[PDB]
Structure formats: C-alpha cells, structure tokens
Amino acid sequence: SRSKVSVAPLHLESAKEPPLNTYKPKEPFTATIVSVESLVGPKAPGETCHIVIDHGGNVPYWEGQSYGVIPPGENPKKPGAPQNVRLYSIASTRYGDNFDGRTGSLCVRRAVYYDPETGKEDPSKNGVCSNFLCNSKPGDKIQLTGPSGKIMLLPEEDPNATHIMIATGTGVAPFRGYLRRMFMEDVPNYRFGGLAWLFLGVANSDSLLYDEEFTSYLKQYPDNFRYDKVLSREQKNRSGGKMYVQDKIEEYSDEIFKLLDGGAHIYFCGLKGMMPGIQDTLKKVAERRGESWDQKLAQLKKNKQWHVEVY
Numbered sequence: 605s606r607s608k609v610s611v612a613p614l615h616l617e618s619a620k621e622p623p624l625n626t627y628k629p630k631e632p633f634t635a636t637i638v639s640v641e642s643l644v645g646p647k648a649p650g651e652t653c654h655i656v657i658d659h660g661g662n663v664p665y666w667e668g669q670s671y672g673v674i675p676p677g678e679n680p681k682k683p684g685a686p687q688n689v690r691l692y693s694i695a696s697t698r699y700g701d702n703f704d705g706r707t708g709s710l711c712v713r714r715a716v717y718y719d720p721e722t723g724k725e726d727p728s729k730n731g732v733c734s735n736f737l738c739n740s741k742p743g744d745k746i747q748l749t750g751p752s753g754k755i756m757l758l759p760e761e762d763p764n765a766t767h768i769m770i771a772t773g774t775g776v777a778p779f780r781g782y783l784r785r786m787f788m789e790d791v792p793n794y795r796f797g798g799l800a801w802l803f804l805g806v807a808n809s810d811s812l813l814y815d816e817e818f819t820s821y822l823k824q825y826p827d828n829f830r831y832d833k834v835l836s837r838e839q840k841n842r843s844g845g846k847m848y849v850q851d852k853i854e855e856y857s858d859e860i861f862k863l864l865d866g867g868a869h870i871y872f873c874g875l876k877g878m879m880p881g882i883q884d885t886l887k888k889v890a891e892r893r894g895e896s897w898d899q900k901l902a903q904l905k906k907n908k909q910w911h912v913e914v915y
C-alpha cells in the first residue's frame with residue numbers, strides 16, 4: 605500500500621486563495637459529528653481526542669488553518685449572549701480523513717481542573733469547549749466558524765523545499781495535515797520530493813499522538829522524512845534534566861542551521877510555554893556559530909521562513 609490514496613474532489617486544488625471567515629460567529633454553520641475517539645493511553649496525564657466533523661463540503665479549508673467552535677450555553681460573563689469562539693487547528697487535509705472533501709478533523713486536549721492541594725477535580729472549573737468536544741457522540745451538532753489563519757499555510761511554490769516542524773501536544777495538528785498531503789494523498793499538482801522533519805514533544809509514550817501514522821512515513825519515505833520524539837517524563841537530557849524539544853533541536857543544531865541557511869521553513873505549534881526554552885537554545889547555537897540570533901531571526905521572518913502559532 606505504498607501507493608498514494610485517491611482523493612476527491614480535485615476541484616479543491618483550483619482555489620487561488622484560501623477561504624477565510626466563510627462563516628462568522630453571528631451565523632455559524634451547523635456541522636455534524638461523525639466520530640470521536642481517544643488518542644492516548646492510560647498513562648497519559650490527560651485525555652486528547654480525535655474528532656471527525658461532517659461539514660458536507662460547505663466549510664472548505666486549506667492545510668494549516670483553524671476552525672472556530674462555539675460551545676452551547678450562555679456567556680458566563682455576558683448573560684443571554686452566546687459563548688465565545690474557541691479556535692482549533694485542523695488536523696486533517698482539505699480532503700479529510702475520508703478522502704472525500706466532506707469532513708474535517710480536530711485534535712482536542714481535555715482541559716480539566718484539579719485543586720493543587722487536595723488534588724480533586726472540580727467539573728465547574730473544567731474547560732467548556734474542550735470537554736464539550738471530547739464528550740461528543742456521532743450525530744451531535746456543532747456550531748462551526750471560520751476557517752481562519754494564514755500563518756500556517758503550507759508554502760508549496762517549491763515542491764522540494766525543506767520543512768522542519770516542531771510541535772508539543774496538540775500542536776501536532778497542522779503537521780498531520782501537511783504530512784498526509786506530502787506523502788499519503790494522490791495530489792497530481794503537488795508531488796513532494798523535499799525533506800520533512802517532524803519533532804514531537806509529549807509527556808510520555810502513552811501521550812504520543814498519531815505515532816503509528818508518522819512511523820509509517822519513515823518506512824515508506826526514508827529519504828524524505830525524519831521523525832524525532834521527545835518524551836519529557838521518560839527521557840533525560842545530557843545534564844540529568846527533563847528532556848524537552850529544544851534539547852533535541854540542540855542535538856541536531858548544526859544540521860538545522862545549515863538547512864535554515866539553505867532556505868528551509870521552520871514551524872512551531874502547540875502550547876506557548878514551549879517557546880521561551882526554544883528561543884534560548886536557538887540563541888546559544890546562533891552565537892556559537894558566530895552570529896546574532898536577533899539578526900538571524902529578523903532575516904528568517906523577512907524571508908518568510910518563520911512560522912509560529914502557539915496558544
């Protein structure tokens with residue numbers, strides 16, 4: 605099955621610009637849930653679920669964009685008014701998990717609150733939209749807005765470009781979409797022949813997301829895909845400290861900077877708390893090479909090689 609999967613409808617490749625704000629909070633699109641499944645094992649710190657939504661082709665999007673979801677209920681801050689929209693990176697390609705251009709998928713981490721002293725959960729303080737989504741069942745309706753976002757659109761001008769993707773937790777979402785388009789789907793107008801390098805940081809092996817899918821790419825395209833996993837609570841860096849993504853980046857610092865100097869695109873997606881540590885590491889490596897990171901970063905942004913979407 606090393607052959608690419610047929611996708612339809614191909615007219616989704618005809619759009620010159622990505623759709624933006626097709627639906628707004630004022631009048632959202634009522635989509636329907638197809639399936640919801642847990643992506644993690646028993647040892648994971650929290651639950652992360654995969655949700656497939658049927659939009660019937662009414663809310664098309666491009667890889668890297670986000671869907672807005674308006675949970676039911678009233679705005680706890682504004683009685684009578686609807687809940688605020690919560691954004692979620694789309695984890696599927698424009699064709700969707702069913703390869704028919706009718707569905708989109710979300711990768712959602714259940715936000716739960718535990719009292720730091722007693723350690724007991726308090727449902728009244730849990731995340732409204734994330735729990736609403738992972739508690740959903742087939743047939744349930746969901747209010748969708750968007751799509752939104754242009755920061756994470758995939759640069760396709762060069763089919764042989766290099767893309768270095770760095771994610772933590774649910775930040776892997778857009779990359780699942782990128783990778784399916786690059787290696788799984790039969791898209792005649794985009795034949796990827798460059799290098800895709802995915803770095804994924806999670807708590808432990810039971811918290812890995814879509815591992816079987818990414819591992820399959822390693823076996824099928826050894827010369828075009830690299831995959832490095834970082835399990836914070838199971839691995840230690842060269843110092844006895846907890847292993848984080850920036851530690852793995854430092855290990856490949858020489859090759860990564862060579863690729864960046866060569867025009868590679870670098871992406872960061874996931875929880876914002878991941879950036880401080882990465883920035884410090886990149887700064888150190890840059891100065892080691894004799895360069896000012898502030899100046900190199902300014903150049904990367906000017907060249908449109910720097911893509912960041914954290915939350």
Ligand SMILES: Cc1cc2nc3c(=O)[nH]c(=O)nc-3n(C[C@H](O)[C@H](O)[C@H](O)COP(=O)(O)OP(=O)(O)OC[C@H]3O[C@@H](n4cnc5c(N)ncnc54)[C@H](O)[C@@H]3O)c2cc1C
Pocket residue numbers: 670690691692693694711712713714715716717728729730731732733734735774775777913914915
């Ligand atoms: C561009 C973008 C992309 C995103 N992509 C994803 C994605 O792919 N996957 C994903 O899971 N998320 C993603 N998010 C985050 C998502 O939009 C939500 O912020 C997240 O799901 C939490 O929403 P919520 O409705 O569950 O929680 P909210 O109800 O908004 O609550 C926020 C937090 O407050 C806590 N809280 C509430 N009341 C109290 C209280 N009294 N005391 C203490 N704590 C309290 C909740 O437990 C929760 O952790 C993205 C955000 C952006 C901007």
